[PDB]
Paper text:
Dihydroflavonol 4-reductase (DFR) and flavanone 4-reductase (FNR) reduce dihydroflavonols and flavanones, respectively, using NAD(P)H to produce flavan-(3)-4-(di)ols in flavonoid biosynthesis. Anthocyanidin reductase (ANR) reduces anthocyanidins to flavan-3-ols. In addition to their sequences, the 3D structures of recombinant DFR, FNR and ANR from sorghum and switchgrass showed a high level of similarity. The catalytic mechanism, substrate-specificity and key residues of three reductases were deduced from crystal structures, site-directed mutagenesis, molecular docking, kinetics, and thermodynamic ana-lyses.
From the early stages of refinement, a difference (Fo–Fc) electron density map clearly indicated the presence of an NADP+ molecule in the binding pocket of PvDFRa, SbFNR1, and SbFNR2 with its nicotinamide moiety properly positioned for the pro-R hydride transfer towards the catalytic site. The bound nicotinamide ring in PvDFRa, SbFNR1, and SbFNR2 established a syn-conformation, whereas the adenine ring adopted an anti-conformation. However, the crystalized SbFNRs did not display any NADP+, thus had to be added for co-crystallization, which indicated that PvDFRa had a higher affinity for NADP+ than SbFNRs, as confirmed by our ITC results. Having both apo- and NADP(H)-bound forms allowed us to observe the conformational change upon binding NADP(H) in the SbFNRs. Compared to the structure without NADP(H), the loop region, 89Val----Pro100 in SbFNR1 (and 89Val----Lys102 in SbFNR2) went through large conformational changes upon binding of NADP(H). Thermodynamic parameters of SbFNR1 were also assayed with ITC for association with NADP+, and it had a Kd of 13.91 µM that indicated a 10-fold decrease in affinity for NADP+ compared to that of PvDFRa as predicted from the crystal structures. In SbFNR1 and SbFNR2, the corresponding catalytic triad is composed of Ser-133/His-173/Lys-177 and Ser-133/Tyr-171/Lys-175, respectively. His-173 is unique for SbFNR1, as all the other compared enzymes including SbFNR2 have tyrosine in that position. In SbFNR1, the 2′ and 3′ hydroxyl groups of the NADPH ribosyl ring were hydrogen bonded only to the sidechain of Lys-177 that was, in turn, indirectly connected to the sidechain Nδ atom of His-173 through two consecutive water molecules. Thus, compared to PvDFRa, the effect of Lys-177 on lowering pKa could be less significant.
Numbering used by the authors:
A (entry chain A), B (entry chain B): 11 to 344
Write the structure that this text describes.
Amino acid sequence: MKTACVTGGSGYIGSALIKLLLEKGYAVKTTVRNPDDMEKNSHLKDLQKLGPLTVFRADMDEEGSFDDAVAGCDYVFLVAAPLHFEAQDPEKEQIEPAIQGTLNTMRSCVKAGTVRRVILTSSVAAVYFRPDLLGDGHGHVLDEDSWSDVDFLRAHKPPTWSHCVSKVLLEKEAGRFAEEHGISLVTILPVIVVGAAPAPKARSSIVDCLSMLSGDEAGLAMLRAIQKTSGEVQLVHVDDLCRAELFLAENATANGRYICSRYHPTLVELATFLAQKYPQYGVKPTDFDDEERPRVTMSLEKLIREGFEYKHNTLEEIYDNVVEYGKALGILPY
Amino acid sequence: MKTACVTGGSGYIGSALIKLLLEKGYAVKTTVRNPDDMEKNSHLKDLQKLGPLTVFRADMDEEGSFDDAVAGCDYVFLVAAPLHFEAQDPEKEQIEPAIQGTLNTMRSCVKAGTVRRVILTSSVAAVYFRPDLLGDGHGHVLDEDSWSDVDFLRAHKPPTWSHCVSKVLLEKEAGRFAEEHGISLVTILPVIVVGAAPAPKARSSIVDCLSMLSGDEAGLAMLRAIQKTSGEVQLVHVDDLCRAELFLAENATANGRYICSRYHPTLVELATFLAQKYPQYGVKPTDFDDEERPRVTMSLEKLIREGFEYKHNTLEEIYDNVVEYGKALGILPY
Ligand SMILES: NC(=O)c1ccc[n+]([C@@H]2O[C@H](COP(=O)([O-])OP(=O)(O)OC[C@H]3O[C@@H](n4cnc5c(N)ncnc54)[C@H](OP(=O)(O)O)[C@@H]3O)[C@@H](O)[C@H]2O)c1
Ligand SMILES: NC(=O)c1ccc[n+]([C@@H]2O[C@H](COP(=O)([O-])OP(=O)(O)OC[C@H]3O[C@@H](n4cnc5c(N)ncnc54)[C@H](OP(=O)(O)O)[C@@H]3O)[C@@H](O)[C@H]2O)c1
């Protein structure tokens, strides 16, 4: 019956979203950059056994190249994103591409004429950087009215500044475009995403949410930075994120942007849980002892108030299947 | 003018609910056991300044004494309840009287013929005691389908077992009665209640939530016992509880029982916050350095799902005015 597009079928979240859509009885069109690279897209053949799944070549840097994948779709899920933070001149090799790639895909949706709603996958990176509140000494519950401070980040350019900036600006641009062209756009703002997916070359948050077990120094540093800034980390199961995305597509009254987040542990509480459940990795929870900081946390109320239900509600349920995914991926050594 | 009854106007929560009802424009009737006790009831005279407030003499052990107080009321808020003590026969001295006193007030509610809805104040004490969930070493989120285990509590009679049993059995019986007589009954289930109220002789949870500042040994043990069991405590501001009670009376869709809770700190997080904001009391957060424990927490979703909004959402807003209240009561030395 209904048809939907997912950009970046080879991606972590995009692969998970394709599965849900097929299981839910959708015809699905997805885009990858190199449909012939079976090292990254071998899962697509398996996913085709669940329902009608069509693969298209596309690149956010090639204008109009999403025209065919998005043609005929009732819903489009803008999941793919550059995400190459790297360095150099981020304003031009990260921020401007991200903004333009988003507008590229948006134009293909207007040219299709069929798209009843675009669902954009942004990030709480576009929510949390509030230099008027961080450093306050007080706790804060941030909601969807909160936007990361682009001006402050451009001025001081702290590490990873271009990530929050890309997300804020691509979302503002996509929203204006949508209003300009009369197309319905809804945005979901995930926290750290945890869980298994079909993608065979996923890295992304799997590396970070598993870093206590692998000892990956970049994942560990990313977790500690979030905790020192917000007094906690925030986690959501990929399958809840996917269901929330589909929920926003299918509920007519859905409107605006939505935090998607479920469990907010401190690092010592997360490490204690992993050490007890997976002792083979030798986690030492005291490695993560930290002061009790004021909590700058994410409000969970918007999706809930509108009738959505998370199914992975405890730490145990959020980590129900990610460890085996990391092992299969090679992210974990055993 | 809509009219509502609040049982136990001398009490902590009862007084704050009276105050809310008046500000919202209700005609309020309330009960106490000695209307002439102006030391204990001075606030009832002060509250007549903000709206119509009539005081009656009633006792839950005295059949029919609530007839006049609930007569002509659209809503009846059953806040009053006998306080817990340690009895040689908690079945005859506590459990059975708690049931009967609840049914006593229920009868007056039908006999009045006007009562559109009864709001019962129970407690998460009727939710949390789940021997499997508490003992299995895993985290859990309890919701409104969870009931404290009466059979287990009777079989093994841990200290204070009769409190949870009294709340479960009286809620069950009140629900049976309401069905059998055609009166709408909604039940609210609060956690530890924090904040200033009009009552001049209030103790209850004010004692417990200030016990870190006061040194009160029974309060500190109460907090520590909850942390030992659940890995945390659960707090809600008395004004949100009062607004939630009113919300459940005025929304015809409301149905069943509702947890009322908002902020769930560990003891060391609560002590750290109090030490930093109230140094004059010499709180030592390290006194609460617990190994931590699996977290058996409360679901907040039911009231949110049905449209209710909490106003005290950070730990600091939950403690926005209770320290001054404990001083005015003499619970806090200075
Ligand atoms: N995972 C989390 O914890 C998290 C949290 C918050 C927000 N998000 C956001 O959710 C989205 C999905 O992220 P993810 O975790 O699934 O990471 P991912 O596995 O790296 O997915 C990124 C996708 O974008 C594709 N892509 C990048 N540049 C492209 C381009 N120029 N043209 C076409 N495709 C391009 C990638 O394909 P190639 O590999 O072929 O380049 C890939 O499929 C992202 O927008 C992320 O920023 C994720
Ligand atoms: N405060 C919390 O953290 C919390 C948490 C969960 C549930 N609750 C429940 O919420 C309700 C209000 O509690 P509270 O904090 O406001 O404690 P409270 O200040 O002690 O109020 C309890 C009231 O019950 C009245 N009462 C006791 N026996 C009575 C009787 N035989 N007849 C008539 N009245 C009687 C008492 O009036 P007298 O002075 O005349 O005895 C008293 O005012 C309670 O049902 C409690 O179980 C409170």
